[PDB]
Amino acid sequence: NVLQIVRDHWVHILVPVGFVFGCYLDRRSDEKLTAFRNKSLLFKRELRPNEEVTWK
Amino acid sequence: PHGSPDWLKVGLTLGTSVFLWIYLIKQHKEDVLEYKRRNGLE
């Protein structure tokens, strides 16, 4: 029953939340390593007309 | 023993926490503003 099993099963939601937070933090840390994006000699690519960044 | 929640101590603890948080937020604001003014960013 709602508002009753929540008080007994609230703990279960924590691990899944951590997985999402870790994914978000991984992307945020990825955003700080773009000093060479579209600058490597191997993947110097000219941007598409409706493109901002080659990868995110 | 047999004692009530001392509302004087509770009020003082909440007041200290709130004052410290408000002071910290202000201090960060003038810190950012002073850094921007000194370094000529904005």
């Binding site: - | 023993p1 047999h2 009530s4 929640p5």
Partner: protein, 320 residues
Amino acid sequence: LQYGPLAFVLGERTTRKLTETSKVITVDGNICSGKGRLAREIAEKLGLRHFPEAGIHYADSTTGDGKPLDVQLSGNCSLEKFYDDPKSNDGNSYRLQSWLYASRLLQYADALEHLLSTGQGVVLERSIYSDFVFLEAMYRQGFIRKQCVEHYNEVKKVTACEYLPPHVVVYVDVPVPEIQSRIQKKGNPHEMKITAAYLQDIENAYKKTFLPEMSEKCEVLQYSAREAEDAEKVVEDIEYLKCDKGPWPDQDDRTFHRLRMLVQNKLEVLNYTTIPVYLPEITIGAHQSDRVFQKFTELPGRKYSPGYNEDVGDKWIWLK
């Protein structure tokens, strides 16, 4: 303001509370006697506070709710079994003696705390002094071993070396034939089996060692069964004598502060009652200790501090 150094610094002094009426007194008597009646009568006549003689569950009356706990959680000993089979294999006799000594120590600490915090004197039955007589009896009857008496002497020395003995001791003298007659008249089946040798040995201990040693540092009032009936004469005897030979007149305000700090904080009072001397009658193995401690924790108002127990009914827990 819970009493501490700061209270002493600002105002709290106990020399002004002493009004020549405090007179911590204790009553000594043979098993089954008028000492209880005489102690109470002295307590109402002199305006003092009476402390009933400490039992197995005296400590239970001062903690949590005053109702006693189980035998397995409080004392792990019984007087009835000691009377039935004093030469037991499981060492009930010395375990009983040690638990009773610790209870008397706690009660003496409580009485001293009351006297020092209020200025009102107290009346006690058998105290930490004269608690040894039963021990000696148990040794002379063969109920306990010698290592028990060395352990008891060590604990008694280390504990009683830090408190002030009572101002005047009141002893009610009772012959053994009449003590046995009164025992038979009570009708208690377990007290029926107290051998006259045990009573006589107990009696010998009080007269031979207890009376002279308290005579040289305190004041003694030897009474008989007939003269213990009229408490007016006993109260008059207490009033007439003046305590000037004991250590009490030499005490002062800072020593009183130290003693008042000691009598509070019952953990330090009972600190040396559990010294690591491994006597089979009292040492407990890890498994039994863990199981009994777990049982004690599961009691209603014993898992947390007194003000933090929800099952008892404490409220506002999350704001205390």
